[PDB]
Amino acid sequence: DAALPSWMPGADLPGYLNGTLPGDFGFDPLYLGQDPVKLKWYAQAELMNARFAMLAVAGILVPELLSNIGFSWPGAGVAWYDAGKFEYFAPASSLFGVQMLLFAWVEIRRYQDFVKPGSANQDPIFTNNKLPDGNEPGYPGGIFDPFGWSKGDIKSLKLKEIKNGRLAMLAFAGFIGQAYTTGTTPLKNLSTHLADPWSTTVWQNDLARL
Amino acid sequence: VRPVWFPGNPPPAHLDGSLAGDYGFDPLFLGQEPQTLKWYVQAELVHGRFAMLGAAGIILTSIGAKVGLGFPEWYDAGKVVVEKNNIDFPTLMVIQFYLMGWAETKRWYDFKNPGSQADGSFLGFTEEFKGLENGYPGGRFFDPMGLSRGDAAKYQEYKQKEVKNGRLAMIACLGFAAQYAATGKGPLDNLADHLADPNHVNFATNGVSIPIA
Amino acid sequence: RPLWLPGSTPPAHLKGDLPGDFGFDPLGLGANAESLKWFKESELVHSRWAMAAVAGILVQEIVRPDVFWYNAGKEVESPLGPLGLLAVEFFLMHWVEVRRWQDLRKPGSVDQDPIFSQYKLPPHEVGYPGGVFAPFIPGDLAELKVKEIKNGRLAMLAFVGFVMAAQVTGKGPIAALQEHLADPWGTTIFSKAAVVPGQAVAPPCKIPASVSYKGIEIPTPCFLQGLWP
Amino acid sequence: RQSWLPGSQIPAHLDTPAAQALAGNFGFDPLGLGKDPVALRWYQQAELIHCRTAMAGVAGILIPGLLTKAGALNVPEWYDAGKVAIENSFAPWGSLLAVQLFLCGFVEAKRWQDIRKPGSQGEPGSFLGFEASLKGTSELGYPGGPFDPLGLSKEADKWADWKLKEVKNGRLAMLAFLGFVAQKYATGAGPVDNLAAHLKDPWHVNYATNGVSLPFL
Numbered sequence: 122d123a124a125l126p127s128w129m130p131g132a133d134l135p136g137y138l139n140g141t142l143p144g145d146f147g148f149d150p151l152y153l154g155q156d157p158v159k160l161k162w163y164a165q166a167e168l169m170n171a172r173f174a175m176l177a178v179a180g181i182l183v184p185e186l187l188s189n190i191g192f193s194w195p196g197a198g199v200a201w202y203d204a205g206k207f208e209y210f211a212p213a214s215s216l217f218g219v220q221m222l223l224f225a226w227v228e229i230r231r232y233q234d235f236v237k238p239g240s241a242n243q244d245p246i247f248t249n250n251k252l253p254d255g256n257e258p259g260y261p262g263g264i265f266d267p268f269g270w271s272k273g274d275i276k277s278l279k280l281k282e283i284k285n286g287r288l289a290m291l292a293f294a295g296f297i298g299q300a301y302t303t304g305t306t307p308l309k310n311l312s313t314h315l316a317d318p319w320s321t322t323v324w325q326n327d328l329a330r331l
Numbered sequence: 332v333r334p335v336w337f338p339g340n341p342p343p344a345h346l347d348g349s350l351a352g353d354y355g356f357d358p359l360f361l362g363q364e365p366q367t368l369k370w371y372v373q374a375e376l377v378h379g380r381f382a383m384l385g386a387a388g389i390i391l392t393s394i395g396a397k398v399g400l401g402f403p404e405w406y407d408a409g410k411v412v413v414e415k416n417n418i419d420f421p422t423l424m425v426i427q428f429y430l431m432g433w434a435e436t437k438r439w440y441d442f443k444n445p446g447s448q449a450d451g452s453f454l455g456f457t458e459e460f461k462g463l464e465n466g467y468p469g470g471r472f473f474d475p476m477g478l479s480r481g482d483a484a485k486y487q488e489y490k491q492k493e494v495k496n497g498r499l500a501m502i503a504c505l506g507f508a509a510q511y512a513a514t515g516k517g518p519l520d521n522l523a524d525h526l527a528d529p530n531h532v533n534f535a536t537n538g539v540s541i542p543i544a
Numbered sequence: 545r546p547l548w549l550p551g552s553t554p555p556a557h558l559k560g561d562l563p564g565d566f567g568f569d570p571l572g573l574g575a576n577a578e579s580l581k582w583f584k585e586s587e588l589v590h591s592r593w594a595m596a597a598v599a600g601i602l603v604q605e606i607v608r609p610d611v612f613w614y615n616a617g618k619e620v621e622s623p624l625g626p627l628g629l630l631a632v633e634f635f636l637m638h639w640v641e642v643r644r645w646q647d648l649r650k651p652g653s654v655d656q657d658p659i660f661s662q663y664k665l666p667p668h669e670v671g672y673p674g675g676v677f678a679p680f681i682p683g684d685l686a687e688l689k690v691k692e693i694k695n696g697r698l699a700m701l702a703f704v705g706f707v708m709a710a711q712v713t714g715k716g717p718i719a720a721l722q723e724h725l726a727d728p729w730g731t732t733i734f735s736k737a738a739v740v741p742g743q744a745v746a747p748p749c750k751i752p753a754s755v756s757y758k759g760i761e762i763p764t765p766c767f768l769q770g771l772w773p
Numbered sequence: 774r775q776s777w778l779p780g781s782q783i784p785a786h787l788d789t790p791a792a793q794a795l796a797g798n799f800g801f802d803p804l805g806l807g808k809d810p811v812a813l814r815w816y817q818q819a820e821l822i823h824c825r826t827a828m829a830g831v832a833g834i835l836i837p838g839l840l841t842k843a844g845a846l847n848v849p850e851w852y853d854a855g856k857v858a859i860e861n862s863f864a865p866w867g868s869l870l871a872v873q874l875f876l877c878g879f880v881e882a883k884r885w886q887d888i889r890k891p892g893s894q895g896e897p898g899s900f901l902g903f904e905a906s907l908k909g910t911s912e913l914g915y916p917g918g919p920f921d922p923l924g925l926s927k928e929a930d931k932w933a934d935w936k937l938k939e940v941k942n943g944r945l946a947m948l949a950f951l952g953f954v955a956q957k958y959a960t961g962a963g964p965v966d967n968l969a970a971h972l973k974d975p976w977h978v979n980y981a982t983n984g985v986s987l988p989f990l
């Protein structure tokens with residue numbers, strides 16, 4: 122109900138999306154963000170899932186891209202879904218326990234700062250080290266931004282972050298779908314589609330297996 | 332004033348000509364009460380609409396059967412479809428009962444409380460289930476052409492045409508059942524037999540209708 | 545005022561304002577304002593589609609007399625696969641029809657170019673975009689609009705006739721015209737069939753029931769062949 | 774007003790301000806079992822207990838059954854887990870059921886006494902100092918203290934919605950267990966197996982094809 126960009130020009134978008142949240146396009150046909158508290162929680166959930174999917178898509182695409190060139194290292198020919206049954210320096214259970222404890226610590230710190238902004242901006246060991254007073258949930262800053270990149274156009278940068286996060290989330294969902302249907306790595310499907318795009322489509326692949 | 336089913340006989344008080352196709356035909360006074368007449372009006376409209384769909388389908392299938400198209404008769408189409416296509420009969424019955432149950436239940440509770448279905452409890456749709464009159468559910472879903480919301484005289488004329496065509500289709504379906512039980516063939520086969528010889532191929536010569544013949 | 549029946553009273557909902565208004569509406573489908581507004585766009589889209597299709601069929605037969613238009617979707621080979629062509633066509637057609645539909649329900653809302661903010665369609669009516677869609681307009685606007693709706697109605701009836709003649713005789717429009725001009729007293733539909741109370745004969749459907757397109761057996765039946773006279 | 778039947782006459786007893794305060798009020802009472810306010814309160818407690826018990830049971834049946842289909846676990850069927858669990862156990866089923874009945878009777882007796890008199894379990898000098906924490910909140914069937922350790926019931930704005938996710942889900946669980954029983958007496962296999970068999974051919978594998986749920990067909 123404003124002049125901000127929309128996902129459907131002319132459509133009557135809901136009134137609870139006023140543009141305050143980053144990447145607001147008024148897309149909510151199910152009206153899941155009607156409740157202000159639910160929307161406040163969904164914003165943080167979307168941001169965390171976005172950054173995690175960004176790291177996931179980057180960690181899926183970079184090793185396969187580096188394996189196809191002269192660059193070599195121990196785990197190169199292994200697929201992203203086949204990395205679990207790999208011979209490491211430690212069993213997966215021990216690593217799972219270690220990461221669960223570390224993630225529990227950082228996630229509890231983030232949750233504490235989420236229920237009360239600025240309540241967790243102090244380093245527990247060194248009292249001198251701290252985060253700036255001006256902070257919002259989901260945007261830590263301080264040591265998390267050592268180069269001061271947020272000091273510039275934060276709105277455009279936040280829009281870039283949310284858009285890249287949505288794109289990465291869709292890409293990861295596509296990775297799962299392609300792995301469950303084709304049963305091959307994503308870059309292989311990309312090259313297969315690039316060789317002949319007219320006969321390498323989702324409709325053709327699914328019709329052949331029907 | 333208006334024509335009646337029996338000329339010279341005064342029309343009853345519960346039939347004043349306000350409803351479509353009102354000819355004052357009620358010798359048993361089954362619709363003397365207002366609520367009972369309302370229920371019977373909706374029942375007659377539903378019966379006529381189903382009879383119209385049935386008569387049209389039976390006539391079209393018999394047309395395809397008379398010409399070399401391989402269409403089965405209406406009294407064998409169920410067996411032909413269930414045996415030709417791998418379709419489970421009880422499953423189809425349950426699906427049909429589910430869809431008809433939902434539609435008829437919404438219609439029934441709308442009859443009990445007019446305009447209640449327009450509250451928006453069904454996917455947010457409101458004006459599509461508001462209803463116009465008894466047995467005439469106007470809206471963008473049932474009447475997307477908007478013929479019930481324009482040119483009142485044309486609407487009343489169409490209402491009269493609908494009730495008359497429905498009664499004719501009900502009589503047609505009864506005739507289909509009697510023709511199949513007496514002659515054993517389809518309605519168009521009976522029509523061709525009658526057109527081939529109308530003086531000797533009729534109900535007075537089938538040997539079943541008139542037992543003393 | 546021109547009408548579809550000289551000396552006849554036109555319906556009350558038709559006052560001769562819209563282009564091509566000749567007071568023809570026995571069913572009164574245009575009595576409602578919203579229904580008429582939607583049907584106007586539908587008729588315009590139908591007119592343009594039928595005109596393009598008739599011109600395509602005529603040029604296809606004149607340039608290629610050995611390729612049947614009814615078989616045009618069957619005997620045409622292209623490096624682009626049928627599934628890829630269908631995907632491209634579905635996406636492009638979906639995009640343009642969504643833009644047109646949004647302009648119908650919300651006028652002056654999708655007239656802006658999304659890639660470039662400097663391009664924008666000028667204010668217009670519904671069903672008549674204009675601007676970039678109308679670079680040259682030789683003649684009067686209302687006169688050309690009437691000519692467009694009349695040519696569209698003729699093209700719609702022409703496409704229906706094309707389909708029926710291709711299903712009954714199996715020949716294209718030019719071939720059917722030449723065959724009809726050769727023996728006009730015996731090549732009309734009245735000569736091909738007749739119905740009486742004792743007999744009902746219809747011309748055979750020249751189109752095969754099934755078409756083997758890459759081993760799929762696409763059914764190609766004659767439109768309401770059982771109801772053929 | 775949300776209703777279980779658009780147009781149906783909502784009962785007067787379900788339209789009172791106290792009855793509408795309950796979570797999941799959809800005006801469903803064709804038998805009028807909630808006309809009496811005391812009976813309605815008791816049945817509300819019964820529905821809450823059934824919802825939580827059904828949710829825990831259906832979860833303990835569905836999750837290990839879903840993990841058994843994959844390679845995560847090897848838990849047997851719910852209708853056969855009792856025999857397998859009692860085979861290589863440390864006590865027979867009778868002794869275990871006796872200890873169970875004792876332990877469950879104590880807490881159910883305390884819950885019954887709190888239902889009869891709200892907050893009565895906080896009698897001084899009766900539970901070695903833990904009696905203070907045994908007093909529930911203002912609403913019956915929603916206690917605090919030892920229960921709810923995360924303290925998610927302190928935020929009222931979501932409280933009214935939280936309860937809606939507890940009753941509704943529980944109601945679904947109550948039907949789920951019912952299906953688990955009916956399917957057991959209709960197909961002879963587990964719930965996950967019935968779901969997979971139905972997904973394989975939904976148009977020919979359902980309750981209208983087993984011959985048990987439709988004997989006239």
Ligand code: CLA
Binds near residue numbers: 303314323
């Ligand atoms: C980041 C989005 C993205 C991208 C770039 C791709 C790309 C590709 N997919 Mg894929 N996919 C996606 C998401 C995506 N997918 C999602 C969300 C799902 C559902 C889980 C799938 C499920 C899927 C299956 C089952 C298959 C593919 C296949 C393919 C490959 C070729 C055929 C094809 O395009 O089918 C069509 C792709 C779709 C219908 C996905 C929906 C549209 C997505 C969201 C893209 C939207 C366009 C958007 C503007 C971004 C454009 C790209 C941009 C980066 C420039 C191709 C390289 C096929 C393959 O592996 O080839 C052998 C295959 O069979 N995809």
Ligand SMILES: CC1=C[C@H](O)CC(C)(C)[C@H]1/C=C/C(C)=C/C=C/C(C)=C/C=C/C=C(C)/C=C/C=C(C)/C=C/C1=C(C)C[C@H](O)CC1(C)C
Binds near residue numbers: 358378389405501
């Ligand atoms: C008015 C009155 C009153 C007074 O007082 C008294 C008296 C006199 C008694 C009266 C009268 C009455 C009457 C006449 C009644 C009747 C009715 C009817 C007939 C109905 C039907 C009705 C009818 C109907 C519905 C019908 C329907 C049908 C259908 C659906 C069909 C279907 C089908 C088809 C398509 C085909 C296939 O293959 C088969 C089937 C499936 C089968």
Ligand SMILES: CC1=C[C@H](O)CC(C)(C)[C@H]1/C=C/C(C)=C/C=C/C(C)=C/C=C/C=C(C)/C=C/C=C(C)/C=C/C1=C(C)C[C@H](O)CC1(C)C
Binds near residue numbers: 823834
């Ligand atoms: C409302 C109303 C009122 C009106 O007025 C009328 C009417 C209509 C009547 C109504 C209705 C009603 C109903 C429906 C009811 C139902 C209920 C239920 C179902 C419950 C369950 C409920 C259920 C439940 C609890 C359940 C539970 C469960 C459990 C524990 C389980 C357990 C187990 C497990 C884990 C596993 C193993 O291996 C086995 C076992 C051991 C087995």
Ligand SMILES: CCCCCCCCCCCCC/C=C\[C@H](O)[C@H](N)CO
Binds near residue numbers: 150151152454455456
């Ligand atoms: C990918 C999931 C897409 C949705 C899948 C089907 C979900 C069906 C939900 C349809 C929503 C029905 C009600 C919609 C709008 C309501 O009128 C408003 N929320 C009421 O204010």
